[PDB]
Amino acid sequence: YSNPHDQIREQLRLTIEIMKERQESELINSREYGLLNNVAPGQLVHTRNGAP
Amino acid sequence: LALRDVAARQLANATKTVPQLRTITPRWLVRLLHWTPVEAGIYRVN
Question: Are A36 and A29 in contact (CB under 8 A)?
Fold first, then answer.
């Protein structure tokens, strides 16, 4: 079933898309690296009334 | 008495055939059919 679309290439393409989404989520949320966990004391600000 | 055949045969290369498969047939039907390629595994006969 690889006409006119390469089946392996589509499976790999989609797989890499999902992995790139997971990579962005890890750059934000990872426990080892990850911006939301590597924030220094004094750089954490709180909203005065909830809304931004 | 001289050199014997069984002893002299230890120096000789035997001619080995490929393994003979007795269930091989000429498979005439495959050779007589016309073969149509189907590029994506689906053949719809309208």
Answer: yes
Rounded Cα gap, residues B24 and A50, in angstroms: 83
**By what method was this entry solved?**
cryo-EM
Which amino acid, A36? Answer: L
Question: What is the sign, positive or negative, of the torsion defined by CA atoms of A47, A48, A49, A51?
Answer: negative
Contact list in B for residue A3 (CB cut-off 8 A) is: 39-40
Residue A3, chain B, CB below 8 Å: the answer is yes
CA distance linking residue B21 with residue A40, whole number of Å: 77
The resolution, in Å, is: 2.2
